[PDB]
Amino acid sequence: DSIQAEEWYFGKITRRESERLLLNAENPRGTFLVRESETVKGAYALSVSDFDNAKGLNVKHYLIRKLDSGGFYITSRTQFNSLQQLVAYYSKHADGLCHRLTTVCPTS
């Protein structure tokens, strides 16, 4: 499946629009989507809802780097062959993120 078939992939959605979808108070902590990065050409971003001890409802953004040789990572130590594999991995455990991925971002 191309990434575009995944319900968590929102392509060229802006960082701002992603926060609008994610900051809904109904969303469980760890609601997420994946999108193109607005600031790094070719890269992706993983946007995750959080409840911060100081800031309350908050959206965290993680940069997903792409290798021309194939593969994706947030940290170069932990590489995946696909965005689908990266999502599956972080859905199991936070492993450094603010929270594990729990919930595919609902639409409006």
Ligand X SMILES: N[C@@H](Cc1ccc(OP(=O)(O)O)cc1)C(=O)O
Of the pair 10, 27, the CB lying nearest ligand X is at 10
Q: Which residues pair with 79 in a beta bridge?
A: 73
- Of 38, 79, 89, 91, the residue at the interface with ligand X (CB under 6 A) is 38
Of the pair 6, 38, the CB lying nearest ligand X is at 38
Tell me which H or E stretch contains 19. Answer: helix 15-22
Of the pair 10, 62, the CB lying nearest ligand X is at 62
- Separation between Cα atoms, residue 98 and residue 76, nearest integer Å: 18
29 binding ligand X? (CB under 6 A): no
